């Protein structure tokens, strides 16, 4: 086959670089066409369009835009009041609409042209549940950002009701990071192991009013719910004997994986810089990381697909699209060995529901691992911590005396007590 | 030729004809509720449904004035939680302890 | 005794944290006043119990 253009909606940075997400769609498909051995005879074409991020009118013309030229995939509007809109137009158009931002899926929701590479939060929610017992807490302090993060973490809320965890759910001040009104309620109250459910941006916003605050101590647990802590400063916070875990699915580790990641920062190259922020170099977050492996699931399902010739649809005269629901297929029951380890999708959903994670923590020698989640196996802890090897020493106790004693009267004799005795 | 709409009655489709009457300017009165994020930059739109935000503090009023210490709220749907989100966060100040199922 | 000129006093404040010592009555210059509570406020030392 040819061209076989996709298409992209991306941001509004307004005279600034483009956006991350846009560089990582722009990567992904200048290395494929590139690497010959991946697609051979085919060569993509992107198409990326802006918009508001909060205008869907906008985000609805600029996919009947995009159909009307004739797009083969949309990558996702990244925010959920945008991408709800492009999801019901691409489900009546026929043409898949792969997401990388986790969205609110409405229960009654009758749709099937979308995948979501984003883990979804019923899959985490029961992972940061798995640290809170593995942790044997009892008193845990959520904190969230927006009024959306109670559905990111209603498998966390609803957990009381089976064990001993006592939640003390609190938001945060609006849209200031000042929270430092919130840190005061939050020390009275001897609150000790608290969940916050941040971004990476508003992590670092919290830690510098948490370090201000006096909490930064060897008597505060704080797990976040990002999974980019790796691109977070820590160097402020290493000594202090804190604990910081959290969940990276970045595999860093392996070596194909952790080039692209230089090669990213060799054509990022600039990386908006900002020094008081209290993040690091920009380490390819999340939301780009994901794209980068958009791209390649979805050329898989070209590869095993040779059919596709890209037809300009209209968008008040809808008709679906000639192989919309056999290409689909191909997408759903993918699989593909990315940078986030294995890519699978809810056949049910297309939702990712088996994955794997890095159940990264904070030591004084930086940021490592101690364990992997495993939505089959569970938490896999790596609980060995030789840094000091000898750890505890346990008591010898009461071994309750074993007598030997026949019976003889009146020294042993038995009782005449009308019930059978213990 | 339209002068005012009337609520489509959905979150997922109410979000859609909002950002369509924001741009082309006609009104948008709706009557259910609707999570609005906390961003989208509109006001061209109403909604006279009796909103959670003050529906929260009517039930949160109440249910300390019986002084139960024991409440179990029950939803349905996802949704539901943005809808009693004050209550949610009420152990934080009183000594209430929820158990939501 | 603080190291000998360098402010790098981690290695000092690593042993006073596990003495339990909340009492510190220092004696240095204005300079190495603030030298040390970078370094101590980086240790988990800056908090209600500790005067
Ligand atoms: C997406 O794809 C998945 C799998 O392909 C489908 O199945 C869901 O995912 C898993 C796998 O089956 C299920 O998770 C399990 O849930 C248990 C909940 O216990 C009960 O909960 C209520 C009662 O409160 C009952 O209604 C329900 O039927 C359960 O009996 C957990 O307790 C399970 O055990 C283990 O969980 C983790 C390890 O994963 C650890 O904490 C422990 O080891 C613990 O033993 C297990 O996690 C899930 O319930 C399935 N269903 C749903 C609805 O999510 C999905 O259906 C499919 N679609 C969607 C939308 O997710
Ligand atoms: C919580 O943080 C503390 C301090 O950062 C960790 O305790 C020490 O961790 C180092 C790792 O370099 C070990 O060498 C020490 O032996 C640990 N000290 C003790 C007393 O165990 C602790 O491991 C962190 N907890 C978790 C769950 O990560
Ligand atoms: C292209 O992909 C193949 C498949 O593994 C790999 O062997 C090769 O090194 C890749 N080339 C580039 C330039 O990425
Ligand atoms: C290259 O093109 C030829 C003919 O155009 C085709 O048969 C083949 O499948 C293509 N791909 C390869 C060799 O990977
Ligand atoms: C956890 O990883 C270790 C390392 O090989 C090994 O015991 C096994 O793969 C895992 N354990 C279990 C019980 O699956």
Known sequence: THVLRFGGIFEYVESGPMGAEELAFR????????????????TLTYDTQKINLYD????????????????????????????????????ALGVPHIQTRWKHQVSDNKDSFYVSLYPDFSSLSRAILDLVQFFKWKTVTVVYDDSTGLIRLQELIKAPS????????????????????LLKEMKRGKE??????????????????????????????????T???????????????????????????????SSIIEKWSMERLQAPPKPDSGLLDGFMTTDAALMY???????????????????????????????????????????????????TFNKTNGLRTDFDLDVISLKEEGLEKIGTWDPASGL??????????ANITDSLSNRSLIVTTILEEPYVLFKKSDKPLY
């Open 56 to 91: 869907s009118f906008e985000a609805s013309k600029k996919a009947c835009d995009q159909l009307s030229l004739g797009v083969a995939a949309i990558f996702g509007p990244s925010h959920s009041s945008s991408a709800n809109a492009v999801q019901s137009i691409c489900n």
């Open 27 to 42: 990567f992904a498909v200048n290395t494929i066409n590139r690497n010959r051995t991946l697609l051979p005879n085919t």
């Open 227 to 257: 999974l980019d802590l790796f691109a977070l400063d820590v160097e402020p916070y290493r000594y202090s004997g804190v604990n910081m875990t959290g969940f990276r699915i970045l595999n860093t580790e392996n070596t194909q994986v």
């Open 380 to 389: 896999n802890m790596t609980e060995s911590q030789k840094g000091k090897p």
């Open 293 to 343: 492996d958009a791209v390649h699931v979805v050329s898989v399902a070209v590869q095993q697909f040779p059919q596709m010739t890209v037809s300009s649809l209209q968008c008040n005269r809808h008709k679906p699209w000639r192989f919309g629901t056999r290409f689909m297929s191909l997408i759903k029951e993918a699989h593909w060995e990315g940078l986030t380890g294995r890519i």
């Open 162 to 181: 089976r064990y001993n965890l006592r939640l003390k759910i609190r938001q945060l001040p609006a849209d200031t990071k000042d929270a430092k009104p």
């Open 192 to 225: 000790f192991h608290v969940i916050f459910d941040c971004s990476h941006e508003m992590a670092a916003g919290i830690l510098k009013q948490a370090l201000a605050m006096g909490m930064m101590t060897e008597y505060y647990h704080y797990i976040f719910t």
